[PDB]
Every structure is written in C-alpha cells, then in structure tokens.
Amino acid sequence: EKTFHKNPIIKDIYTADPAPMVYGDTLYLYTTHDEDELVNDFYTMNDWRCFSTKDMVNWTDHGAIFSLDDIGWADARAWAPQAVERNGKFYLYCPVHKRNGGMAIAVGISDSPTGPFKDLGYPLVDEGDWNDIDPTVFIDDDGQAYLYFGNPELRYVLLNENMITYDKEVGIVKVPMTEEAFAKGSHDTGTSYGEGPWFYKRNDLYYMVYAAFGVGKQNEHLAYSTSDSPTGPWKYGGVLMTEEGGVFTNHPGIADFKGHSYLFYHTGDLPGGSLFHRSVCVAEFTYNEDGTINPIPKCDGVEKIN
Ligand SMILES: [Ca+2]
Question: Which EC number(s) does UniProt give (predicted)?
Fold first, then answer.
C-alpha cells in the first residue's frame, strides 16, 4: 500500500498556479500548464489541467479540461484559474487576454468537475485594463459568493447565485492598498501584495493569501492577511512561505480535506524544470489556535489520508 507521495505531485507535465477544490470525497486540483515546447523561450500557456485524488497520494490525470481555443473571444494567456461547485454545476474562472482588448475573466461551466467546460460566450469581468488576473472565488455562509482578483491592485465583485453574473450596482470594488493590510513591499502599490489572491473563511476568520514581494526583493514569496468580514478591512498576517527553493513566481492554493489542511504551491524542481517549466507541490500544515498560520517550509511530500 502506497502511503506517501513525494513532491512534485505530477511528474510528466509542467504545471503551476494550483487551485484545489474539494467536492464530496474527492479533491480536484486545477492548474495552469507550462508547455514542454516553449514559444520564444518564454512562458507558454494554452490550457488548464485537472488532477484528482481521494487520499492525497494516488492522483488521477484528467488532462485538459478547458483551453484558450474553447474561448471564442480570447487569444492568449491561459493564466491562474479557480473552480467552484454550486447547485449541481461547476464553474471555472479563468484570467485570459481578450482579443484586441485587455485582461478579462472568463467563466467556463460544466456539469462535471472534470469538464469539458463550456465558455459563457463573453467575458464575465472585462474592465478594459490589464489588472484583473488570478481570480479566486468563495461562497460565504450567508449565500453570498465573492470573486477577488488583481495585480497589482486587489479588487472584487459580488457574484450572483447563478455564478455567471455579478452585481453591477455594487460593481467592481477596489481594496485599499495599505501597509496595514498588505505590509510594506516592493510591488507597484508600495505594499507586499503581488498577485494570486486566495480568499476563504475558516472558523469565523476570513483569509486572503497571496503571492507577495518583500522590501528589496525580486522573487515572490507567499503571505496572508485576515479580516472579520468578507470584504475587509484586511489586516496583514505574515509570511506563509519564503522564496527559498522556489522560482520567480509562487502561487498559493489552500484546502481542507478530510480534516487535514494543505498548502499547494509551485517550484521548478522537475527534471528540465525552470521558472517557465514549473511543477505543483503540496505541504500539510496546521493552524494556530487563534487562526494565524506559521511559515510553512517547502515539503518533501505528504502522507496518505483516510
Ligand atoms: Ca489562484
């Protein structure tokens, strides 16, 4: 019986920007995909992948579940996604380049967590600028869903119950980009907030985890902030994972599965790995009693769970 799985999770394909979703007895891990053959020696990202597990050590590869070619209005940049389930359907939020436009958020819909996903037909969020990447979605206890996104500015909308529209009266809301919320740092706002927001609630505390840029630093680390409310005010928490052992990017995804807590992240540790050929990894961790989280070291692998 296999009882351990050594990182990186998947070894025959380069993956990044992990977004776990637990539904019932199964954890589904959605990722971006760094092509084996790079175009112009640079990031080459066309489709999204899904890998599932029932036990954290045996993984099933579902291949491409959605792609830029499935989105009629988008031409480039299959960037960090997140999926969510609601009312018997699965929604995949994907940041992409809108042809002849800026960065927009697509929503794909499927009756299955492993697709194939069908694009809505037009963008869900489309402000005309280049900020709105790396969406994260969470459905709160009161039934209100939120969609956060952005680099270098964190923004959100209130998603409606159908998950394919948002409240246009509230519109797109900007988060104040303060040191109080996101620490001092080297990103465009002068705070450490970078990209890859990951929004959720656990035991009456809300969390915003993100890729971050420290003062005087070039590479991303992972950090987090907290709030008593889903829309703030956000207060800086601390470092969740340092840059050590990583590549220029890191990107967080957190899930509880069968009573255990996991941080998914990425590195360039696969054979032939690099900043453009990444690999998703996972570390188990535990929360402090007061809801804070100590820094998580990079991890050799995880144990089977039941
Ligand atoms: Ca993400």
Answer: 3.2.1.37
